[PDB]
């Protein structure tokens, strides 16, 4: 899988993208990799923020489906025209697939001014595809139409400019150290998993573990933050606040309402605790844990005209749609989306940032009872 290593690029806070081609002859576009959604959608009109866009008129293989799609978000949206065309991934497998593509013709707060991507690749399941689950996701079409194995893996690095690898159809052992540990995909809609225990520094929060997964707990490469049900974020913050009390910061910091600033090189990482999420394992009463650092949940904020410090944003935040494990978590690990066996694997990433003090880790087995009660029905 050597051709695929370092096939991802990005800017901190703005996701990771892969080069793709669409149509005949091929039109190259940079496409955001998103395991938290299930539509393949590309800019198809000259929006001022876009470097390029899909020009259906130049493609002999384009087919109109004569149906639209409208995707709202909390204060924006994208809207498009559905079609199919031939899709390839230059630094991916040596195949071409006929995929559904939403040609985006109107949007609000979707495209980012200054970004270098022009569409989104939804890698999740049909259940959450819009307008309904009959629109086959890309990866489903890729598996159905070729000999590519039903799995993919992501190594997100981010050291400004971030990088990574999306290995389509396999695992690459050079991207991780130690062993992979696997947690079941609870249900194939989002990549849903179940968190059974949470330590901050070593000390569990001791909440009905059902709360950790209320109503959902998910692995999402498109979402930047570790998102948490309010009840858990509340308690989560309370404890991180506590062993971080060597220094002070405003209450707005912990709500993502202001950034925290330190002189260059003077970030006190050690004042901040680790977070350990224990995940449901493959066997009854067996769990494993993944351990991240402040360097993962304390995110450098790119540019500052109003400052010249090392400023960061607290990247844990609350939710009403369940737990969401974003780039904060994934930059610590090589993550294997083993769709064939309805499981997700985690291993220590060979590119995660460490030193001599503390490290990202994946460890097991642990004994955890009543993990099934941790799931919301």
């Amino acid at each position: 899988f050597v051709e695929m290593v370092d096939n991802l690029r990005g800017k901190s806070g703005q996701g990771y993208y892969v080069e793709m081609t669409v149509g005949s002859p091929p039109q190259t576009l940079n496409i955001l990799v998103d395991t938290g959604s299930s539509n393949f959608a590309v800019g198809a009109a000259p929006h001022p923020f876009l470097h390029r866009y899909y020009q259906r008129q130049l493609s002999s293989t384009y087919r109109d489906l004569r149906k639209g799609v409208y995707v709202p978000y909390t204060q924006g949206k994208w809207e498009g025209e559905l079609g199919t065309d031939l899709v390839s991934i230059p630094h991916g497998p040596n195949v071409t697939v006929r995929a559904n593509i939403a040609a985006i013709t109107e949007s609000d707060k979707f495209f980012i001014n200054g970004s270098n991507w022009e569409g989104i690749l939804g890698l999740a399941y049909a259940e959450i595809a819009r307008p309904d689950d009959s629109l086959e996701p890309f990866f489903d079409s890729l598996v159905k139409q070729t000999h590519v194995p039903n799995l993919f893996s992501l190594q997100l690095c981010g050291a400004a400019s971030v990088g990574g690898s999306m290995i389509i159809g396999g695992i690459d052992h050079s991207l991780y150290t130690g062993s992979l540990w696997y947690t079941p995909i609870r249900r194939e809609w989002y990549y849903e998993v179940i968190i059974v225990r949470v330590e901050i520094n070593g000390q569990d929060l001791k909440m009905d573990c059902k709360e950790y997964n209320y109503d959902k707990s998910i692995v999402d490469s498109g979402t930047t933050n570790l998102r948490l049900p309010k009840k858990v974020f509340e308690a989560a913050v309370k404890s991180i606040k506590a062993a971080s009390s060597t220094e002070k910061f405003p209450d707005g910091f912990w709500l993502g309402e202001q950034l925290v600033c330190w002189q260059a090189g003077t970030t006190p990482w050690n004042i901040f605790p680790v977070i350990s999420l224990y995940l449901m394992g493959e066997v009854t009463n067996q769990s494993f844990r993944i351990t991240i650092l402040p360097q993962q949940y304390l995110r450098p904020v790119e540019d500052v005209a109003t400052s010249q410090d090392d400023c960061y944003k607290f990247a844990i935040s609350q939710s009403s749609t369940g737990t969401v494990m974003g780039a904060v978590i994934m930059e610590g690990f090589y993550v294997v989306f083993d769709r064939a066996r309805k499981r997700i694997g985690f291993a220590v990433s060979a590119c995660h940032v460490h030193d001599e003090f503390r490290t990202a880790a994946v460890e097991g087995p642990f004994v955890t009872l009543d993990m099934e009660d941790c799931g919301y029905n």
Side-chain angles (χ1 to χ4, degrees):
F1 296 101
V2 299
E3 75 251 56
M4 303 185 215
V5 173
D6 65 79
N7 66 357
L8 304 184
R9 288 181 138 50
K11 277 239 170 53
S12 176
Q14 312 197 141
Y16 292 78
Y17 60 82
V18 71
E19 185 183 299
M20 304 184 79
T21 60
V22 176
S24 313
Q27 297 177 41
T28 303
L29 301 161
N30 286 332
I31 303 295
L32 186 158
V33 172
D34 188 18
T35 62
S37 73
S38 307
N39 282 93
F40 180 36
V42 298
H47 183 275
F49 296 176
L50 297 185
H51 289 77
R52 37 201 185 172
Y53 52 92
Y54 181 28
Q55 296 183 284
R56 284 164 299 168
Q57 73 268 17
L58 303 188
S59 175
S60 54
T61 43
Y62 169 72
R63 301 179 199 168
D64 202 350
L65 280 166
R66 314 183 33 123
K67 184 170 193 190
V69 212
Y70 188 105
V71 176
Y73 303 104
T74 303
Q75 258 287 289
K77 66 97 176 245
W78 65 262
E79 151 162 40
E81 297 172 2
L82 289 165
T84 64
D85 212 334
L86 294 182
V87 181
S88 200
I89 304 179
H91 305 289
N94 184 50
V95 298
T96 297
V97 347
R98 177 163 294 271
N100 291 312
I101 305 172
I104 296 167
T105 55
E106 183 174 16
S107 70
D108 174 273
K109 296 175 188 311
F110 180 70
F111 298 123
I112 296 163
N113 194 30
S115 83
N116 192 221
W117 55 261
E118 295 97 46
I120 186 168
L121 182 58
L123 288 170
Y125 295 100
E127 196 82 329
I128 57 175
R130 288 123 188 183
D132 56 73
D133 70 15
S134 68
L135 197 84
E136 183 170 85
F138 175 73
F139 206 81
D140 286 76
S141 308
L142 170 74
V143 175
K144 178 148 188 195
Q145 294 173 35
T146 72
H147 291 295
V148 172
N150 188 22
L151 91 168
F152 68 89
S153 54
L154 289 174
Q155 187 204 55
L156 310 179
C157 299
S161 186
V162 301
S165 300
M166 180 175 57
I167 311 298
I168 297 296
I171 307 176
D172 184 334
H173 307 301
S174 67
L175 299 175
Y176 72 99
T177 65
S179 172
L180 284 159
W181 284 82
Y182 298 93
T183 190
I185 294 166
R186 190 193 177 182
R187 184 148 86 81
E188 300 162 285
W189 61 317
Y190 300 86
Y191 286 104
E192 194 187 357
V193 300
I194 292 176
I195 289 156
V196 304
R197 192 175 163 87
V198 188
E199 293 172 1
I200 279 128
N201 236 44
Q203 310 180 201
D204 66 330
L205 286 33
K206 226 182 138 145
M207 312 177 221
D208 182 9
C209 65
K210 239 144 184 146
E211 303 291 10
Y212 294 140
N213 313 297
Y214 177 46
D215 67 290
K216 251 201 289 113
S217 262
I218 80 174
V219 183
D220 188 352
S221 65
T223 294
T224 295
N225 293 335
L226 202 231
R227 302 193 64 218
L228 301 178
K230 7 155 272 199
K231 189 155 159 216
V232 187
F233 166 81
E234 284 273 325
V237 163
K238 181 169 145 45
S239 176
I240 298 170
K241 229 178 264 207
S244 64
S245 303
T246 289
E247 285 162 52
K248 184 159 59 170
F249 331 104
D251 268 38
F253 169 63
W254 306 108
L255 272 284
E257 291 172 348
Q258 99 198 174
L259 21 79
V260 70
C261 294
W262 286 295
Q263 300 178 182
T266 61
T267 307
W269 293 124
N270 274 262
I271 300 302
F272 296 98
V274 291
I275 181 162
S276 273
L277 310 175
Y278 292 67
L279 302 177
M280 177 176 278
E282 296 195 272
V283 173
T284 292
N285 283 339
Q286 171 267 313
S287 67
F288 63 99
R289 80 175 173 216
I290 69 176
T291 295
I292 62 157
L293 302 177
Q295 9 290 94
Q296 275 55 168
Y297 70 76
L298 255 50
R299 70 203 232 70
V301 169
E302 222 148 282
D303 299 82
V304 271
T306 56
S307 189
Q308 223 76 274
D309 276 346
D310 289 341
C311 297
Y312 309 71
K313 189 170 177 185
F314 194 61
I316 313 194
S317 69
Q318 350 179 220
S319 301
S320 69
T321 51
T323 291
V324 188
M325 287 166 76
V328 164
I329 298 281
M330 299 182 68
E331 277 154 28
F333 312 101
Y334 186 52
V335 186
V336 177
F337 298 78
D338 186 358
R339 296 160 57 106
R341 312 210 181 282
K342 293 196 41 173
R343 68 188 185 172
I344 300 163
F346 292 84
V348 175
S349 178
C351 80
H352 93 95
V353 295
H354 54 291
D355 42 48
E356 267 52 84
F357 278 72
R358 306 186 283 184
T359 312
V362 184
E363 289 158 310
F366 295 98
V367 178
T368 310
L369 310 186
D370 298 330
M371 295 186 293
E372 255 68 13
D373 298 350
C374 299
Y376 182 74
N377 296 303

